[PDB]
Specification:
This is part of a larger assembly, with chains A, B and C.
Chain A (H helix, E strand, L loop, with lengths): L4 H11 L5 H17 L2 E10 L6 E8 L21 E5 L7 E2 L25 E3 L3 E5 H16 L1 E3 L3 E2 L4 E2 L18 E3 L41 E5 L8 E5 L6 E3 L8 E5 L35 H8 L2
Chain B lengths: L2 E3 L10 E2 L1 E3 L5 E2 L2 E3 L2 E2 L1 E6 L5 E6 L6 E6 L5 E7 L2 E9 L5 E4 L8 E7 L4 E7 L6 E6 L3 E7 L7 E6 L3 E6 L12 E2 L2
Antiparallel strand pairs in B: 1-3, 2-5, 3-4, 4-7, 5-6, 7-8, 8-9, 9-10, 10-11, 11-12, 12-13, 13-14, 14-15, 15-16, 16-17, 17-18, 18-19
Chain C lengths: L2 H6 L1 H4 L8 H17 L4 E8 L6 E7 L8 E5 L6 E2 L5 H4 L16 E2 L3 E2 H15 L3 E2 L3 E3 L5 E3 L17 E2 L19 E5 L6 E5 L5 E6 L4 E8 L7 H4 L1
Parallel strand pairs in C: 1-14
Antiparallel strand pairs in C: 1-2, 2-3, 3-4, 5-6, 7-10, 8-9, 11-12, 12-13, 13-14
Classes of the chains: A alpha+beta, B mainly beta, C alpha+beta.
Family (chain C): Belongs to the flagellar radial spoke RSP9 family.
Keywords (chain C): Cell projection, Cilium, Cilium biogenesis/degradation, Cytoplasm, Cytoskeleton, Flagellum
Subcellular location (chain C): Cytoplasm, Cytoskeleton, Cilium axoneme; Cytoplasm, Cytoskeleton, Flagellum axoneme; Cell projection, Kinocilium
């Protein structure tokens, strides 16, 4: 089912974000083809990601029920970072291509690089770890991290793993979503440093924040504050909408009136760092066998020891 | 006590090629001279450790290959019973070291292959530790700088295959300051 | 970009998507009409936006009759009160190199790495203008009087030499300017097109956030930088 993405696009231009009116309508027509092609329950505009000569346009596709060293293995079906299937379009009119699923630590803990997107799925990523697969896997991993650290709902929208929409949500004011960051809560699950959203015991039991936590408790980074709250229509503040603005991910926004909400990202798909991108360090060099009593050549018995053994 | 099913000289010492079983568990089936190990010889251990190479004066001096039971393996030069000279070392998970050795100590110029990555660490090795002039080669880029203790220490020079010489110093042990210059090279 | 491109809403159609609001579109139209009134500039361009933490920076630039003259850039926060930024020297350029961190807002902010926020804004503005400002082929005509004027018979760039990259110059002191093929490093420009061959999109990668639109058949050009306010030296790691 198509969401109201044109009035959400008018909300984007009210916040100043967006591809333009005709390009957002063109993305809406491409999403209409995507909904008419595949049995999709929810197909909303996740956003678009800039590249070198082509840009990726991403859809949050959720299908219908039943229709369509040690290695930590992948999620089975519709759990964790693989909850929403992502479809990628270059320019609308060209057919959408299905992305693969996010795998654990072989992909997520080998993601720790800074790389521009080249606009093609079948492009090798040559960096400090060998990234498995082509650029589609790195795009999918970046989309998973932006979904984990960007998709942010107002407080009271969902009841607390999974979540359902709240029918008793009376709504929250626009001015209450600007002065306080505790009134915004995260939509989907946090990606663990292991590489998943649910912890797998390799036989530590490390955990992150729960599903519906305020984003004031997860505020980064170092000395600067993430999730800049600004008021578009500052001139006429009675009908303003609160425009969230993530500084950890540049180009990431969330929106009020607060009775409903939409999430949008457009950028280069990169996490901002206050310093420069330090490369990941090489693994420490393996030592040899410790030269001790065990690894030692004996100097053999001599003729005095032989004559001691002969009369024995 | 040990046995010796080989040949002895006119005095009584072990001389020439002959099998020998050491009393503590090891054995040796190589060549003997003046009651000491000399020449090409095989030395088995109590476990599956193995040395097949040259001996001089009851000491490993020459080109020979050593097998360790944990998975590490050395082929190359030996001298004075410790690692000395050019040689190739593989570690327990195919980590490949081809370089100099001083005295069991991994010295000189040495190429370190991180086979889980494919990246190369070549440059100056001091006392089993990454210290000196270094060139951390990767697949499409390399770091021409200086290492102190398994980490870069100071001013570096980053070579990229797309044609840029990034200048940047290490202001800390972990972080990197990319200031100030990027040069065409 | 001029106010004519502010009328067509061409920042969103370039595809960068950080864009501008009809709030700020009407505010830049009236306020840049005021900037052309009070200061006698030949042309006034909305330079772009510097991304903030407590307030948003809005930057516009004015030019004299000489098109390569040192510009009198201006800044505004509430998009009506435009105020003249001082010119930048090299002493202020190497001063702000010890400060690494996001642009905050509230221009009397002080950095402990003192160093004023306005000096950082002005030096960052001169760095972006000296590095990734863009002029196409035949847009500027070098007059023999010693000044530079807008070429008013500028036919737009044909589709054969859009992708060379040898048909785009810099909007500063040096077909009499320095081309894009000598930029360090090579490949630091995102070469792109819009729907059809109606607009050519150039995005700087030494500064993530500047977008250059160019219609290949009409005299429509200009650069807008809306973005982080930082020079990433991580760019060789990206390519």
């Amino acid at each position: 089912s198509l969401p109201n993405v044109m009035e959400s696009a008018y909300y984007f231009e009210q916040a100043g974000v967006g591809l333009g009116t005709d390009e957002t309508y063109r993305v809406f027509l491409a999403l209409k083809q995507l909904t008419d092609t595949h049995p999709i329950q929810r197909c909303r505009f996740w956003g678009k990601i800039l590249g070198l000569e082509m840009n990726y346009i991403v859809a949050e596709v959720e299908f219908r029920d039943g229709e369509d060293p040690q290695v930590i293995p992948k999620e089975e079906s519709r759990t964790g970072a693989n909850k929403y299937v992502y479809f990628v379009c270059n320019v609308p009119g060209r057919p959408w291509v299905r992305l693969p699923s996010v795998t654990p630590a072989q992909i997520v803990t080998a993601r720790k690089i800074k790389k521009f997107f080249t606009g093609r799925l079948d492009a090798a990523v040559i960096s400090y770890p060998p990234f498995p697969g082509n650029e589609s896997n790195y795009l999918r991993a970046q989309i998973a991290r932006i979904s984990a650290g960007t998709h942010v709902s107002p407080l009271g929208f969902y009841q607390f793993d999974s979540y359902e929409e709240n029918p008793d949500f009376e709504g929250i004011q626009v001015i209450d979503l600007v002065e306080s960051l505790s009134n915004w809560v995260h939509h989907v699950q946090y990606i663990l440093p292991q590489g998943r959203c649910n912890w797998f015991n390799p036989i530590e039991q490390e955990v992150g924040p729960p599903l519906l936590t305020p984003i004031s408790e997860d505020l980064g980074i170092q000395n600067i504050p993430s999730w800049t709250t600004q008021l578009s229509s500052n001139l006429i503040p009675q009908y303003a909408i609160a425009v969230l603005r993530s500084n950890l991910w540049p180009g990431a926004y969330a929106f009020s009136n607060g009775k409903k909400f939409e999430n949008f990202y457009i950028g280069w798909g990169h996490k901002y760092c206050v310093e420069n991108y330090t490369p990941p360090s090489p693994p420490p060099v393996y030592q040899e066998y410790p030269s001790g009593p065990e690894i030692t050549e004996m100097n053999d018995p001599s003729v005095e020891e032989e004559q001691a053994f002969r009369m024995t | 006590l040990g046995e010796y099913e080989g040949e002895r000289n006119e005095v009584g010492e072990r001389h020439g090629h002959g099998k020998a079983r050491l009393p503590n568990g090891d054995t040796y089936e190589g060549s003997y001279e003046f009651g000491k190990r000399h020449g090409q010889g095989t030395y088995k251990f109590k476990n599956g450790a193995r040395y097949t190479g040259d001996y001089v004066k009851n000491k490993k001096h020459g080109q020979g290959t050593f097998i360790y039971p944990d998975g590490s393996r050395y082929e190359g030069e030996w001298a004075d019973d410790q690692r000395h000279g050019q040689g190739v070392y593989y570690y327990v998970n195919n980590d490949t070291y081809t370089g100099e050795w001083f005295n069991h100590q991994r010295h000189g110029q040495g190429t370190y292959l991180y086979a889980e990555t494919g990246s190369k660490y070549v440059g100056t090795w001091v006392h089993g530790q990454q210290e000196g002039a270094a060139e951390l080669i990767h697949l499409n880029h390399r770091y021409q700088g200086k290492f102190m203790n398994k980490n870069p220490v100071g001013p570096g020079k980053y070579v990229f295959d797309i044609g840029c010489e990034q200048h940047g110093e290490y202001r800390l042990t972990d972080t990197e300051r990319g200031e100030e210059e990027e040069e065409e090279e | 970009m001029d106010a004519d491109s502010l009328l067509l809403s061409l920042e969103l159609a370039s595809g960068s998507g950080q864009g501008l609001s009809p709030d700020r579109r009407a505010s830049l139209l009236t306020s840049l009409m005021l900037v052309k009134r009070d200061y006698r500039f030949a042309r006034v361009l909305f330079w772009g936006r510097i991304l903030g933490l407590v307030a948003d920076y809005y930057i516009a630039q004015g030019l004299s009759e000489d098109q390569l003259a040192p510009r009198k850039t201006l800044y505004s926060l509430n998009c009506t009160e435009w105020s003249l930024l001082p010119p930048a020297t090299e002493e202020m350029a190497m001063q702000i190199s010890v400060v690494s961190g996001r642009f905050m807002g509230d221009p009397s902010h002080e950095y402990e790495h003192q160093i004023k926020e306005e000096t950082r804004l002005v030096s960052i503005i001169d760095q972006i203008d000296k590095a990734v400002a863009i002029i196409p082929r035949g847009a500027l005509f070098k007059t023999p009087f010693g000044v530079t004027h807008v070429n008013r018979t500028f036919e737009g760039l044909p589709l054969s030499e859009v992708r060379k990259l040898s048909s785009y110059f810099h909007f500063r002191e040096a077909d009499f300017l320095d081309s894009l093929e000598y930029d360090i490093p090579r490949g630091s420009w995102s070469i792109q097109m819009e729907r059809g061959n109606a607009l050519v999109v150039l995005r700087s990668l030494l500064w993530p956030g500047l977008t250059f639109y160019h219609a290949p058949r009409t005299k429509n050009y200009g650069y807008i930088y809306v973005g982080t306010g930082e020079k990433n030296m991580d760019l060789p790691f990206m390519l």
